[model samples]
Target: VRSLNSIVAVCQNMGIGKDGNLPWPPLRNEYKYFQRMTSTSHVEGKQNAVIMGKKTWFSIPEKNRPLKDRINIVLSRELKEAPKGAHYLSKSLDDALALLDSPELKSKVDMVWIVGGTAVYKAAMEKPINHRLFVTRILHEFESDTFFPEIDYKDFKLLTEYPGVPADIQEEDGIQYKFEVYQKSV
Candidate 1:
């Protein structure tokens, strides 16, 4: 896995969703932050890759995918082929990493992002690969059935600041949140 990272928002209870979708209302500013982070790359000529579970893939509206300029990879054993605009379809997370690390894509991709559903998040966390987490902590609780997977504090250290990430708590649509980056402890 080439520089694997993850981005997510969770409530005080670590709830991420309800049923098949987000339980909270849309936060435009946070959404833009996601767009900027995912679209930008360290290498000028290369692009970032986003690996998402099949449920997460389907959660996105049809019009907004293949998620603009970034490489879109969907993970599902059930998918016979890549969906409409997706760049790749992998049966497993390991396969997705291999596909991105292949000669055809290796030099062209800068980083890999795990945008998830519960199982996918847990799988990525279990692997020994170095990882960076971009977490948006929602200051309130919400009723939800789906939750962000438990993260190990011993493995990830919180950063006081991260480039391109907002340092202050953000409030929108009556919801208060803050952006935080957790770097894997060396």
Candidate 2:
């Protein structure tokens, strides 16, 4: 299996979303950073895979489903078929990993990203090796029912520097935020 990583933006309280959508206004530069980070292709013809829960799949605008260049996999046992633009349907995270591990997909994919709603992130964090987190910390809070799972500092440690990741605080749309990365310790 290839390395697994996650990219999420959260508030001070670790809130991720509200009413099925991002609570804050669009942070154009942050959004572009997210795109560049996940869309990066080290080798031509090999793409990255993004794994998200079914609800997340629907939360995306219909016109932008499957998220462009990445191979999209949605996890759902209730759904009988993969939603419109998604490339694969998986019953669980393990199932998704199994699919990506296949010789055909393995050859075509470079990295696997866990894009979420609560359950999926918790499960993926259980296996720490080969896992990294790209966090956009919004320096404020919003009322939210959904949250990013807490990181166990024992297993994952914050890094002072990471390649392709900016280390300074950023301000955009009048909201202060910074990009942070955490990696499972060796």
Candidate 3:
């Protein structure tokens, strides 16, 4: 297995959307969350790339398809064509890793951001990867048909936390959220 130091980040709600659109209405605020994590100096100059599953890609609004201002790599067995300015992998997840490991890319990218759609996240857990998970705990329980699989809290340790509520978002019981990081224990 290749040594991987992946940077994983997920919303506090773990809610990408109710179905395919966002679960919350304050969309720009969530978009800002993504920007905040990815634009760090270490990530910006190190040729960092964001890798996500096909469903995740499709779920993004059409206007957000290219994910401008970032290097987007879509993983799919059926992605014969990637949108302009984005990359595509028409292979299995393992094959995608091989492509990521190629000399050309290796010299350019130091870390990969694995955004998900369940299967991709599941596959990532099988291999050791670093992650920065962000969660926004909502006040109400969701009745989502598609669930984000839970991971064992024992394997990772909290690194950081930012607690607050954005003006655009609403909480049913005044419940707030924190931007939390989890690092894989060696």
Candidate 4:
């Protein structure tokens, strides 16, 4: 089953954020790729589901709230209800996944794309099965307070290159970076 997937940008040291938001200047091509990958559906009329940590949800600017087209689910143990713009809410990754597996959304969801902070990423990657990690390797290291969870090579292997995804290092504002896809081996 192709149920769990993730998309994230990390620095040379696996740093993903500074303070509460992105630390590096945006990469135009990668940004577009994120949008394109998350919005496209395998089944017409169905939508991909974007699941994220509560902080990740709030980190998006007001105007970009729902991330348009895709269904947005925010996860938190304390949030009593889904925040404004969230299509659904869950207490944890399992809960979020269960919602997608439920009869209501089971057929309507084309994919599950987890947008993360550390705990969420850590939880999903803990198991070594059926997962795809869409990662952008930012060539430079940053002074980051947040980092991506460590990935085990024994369980995941890089695709090297992919269709609709450029393998060449892309440069923007003197920052060199490129995309990668890690698929589960176990």
Q: Could you estimate the TM-score for every candidate?
A: 0.94, 0.96, 0.73, 0.95
The alpha-carbon deviation from the true structure for residue 5 of candidate 4, after best TM-score superposition, in angstroms, is: 1.1
Clashes of 2: 0
All candidates: CA RMSD (Å)? 1.3, 1.1, 4.5, 1.3
For model 4, residues 50-120, the per-residue Cα lDDT tens digits are: 98999999999999889999899999999999999999999988888788889989888898888898988
CA lDDT of each prediction against the hidden true structure:
0.87, 0.88, 0.57, 0.87
RMSD of 4: 1.3
* lDDT for model 3: 0.57
Task: Point out the higher-scoring one by TM-score: 2 or 3.
Answer: 2
* Alpha-carbon runs more than 4 Å astray in model 4: none
Question: What is the per-residue lDDT of model 2 for residues 1-186, given as tens digits with 9 covering 90 to 100?
Answer: 646898899998999989999878788998898788888888999999999998889999999877989999999989999988999999999999999989889899988888898899998999745789899999987787799888899888899999877788889878899889988844
Point out the worst 10-residue segment of candidate 3 by lDDT.
Answer: 1-10
Ranking by TM-score: 2, 4, 1, 3
lDDT tens string, model 1, 1-186? 545798888888899889889878888987888888888887889999998898888899999899888999998989899988899999998898888879999888987888888888888877788889999998988888999888898998899988878788889999999999997844
Worst 10 residues of 4 by lDDT: 120-129
Clashes of each: 0, 0, 4, 0
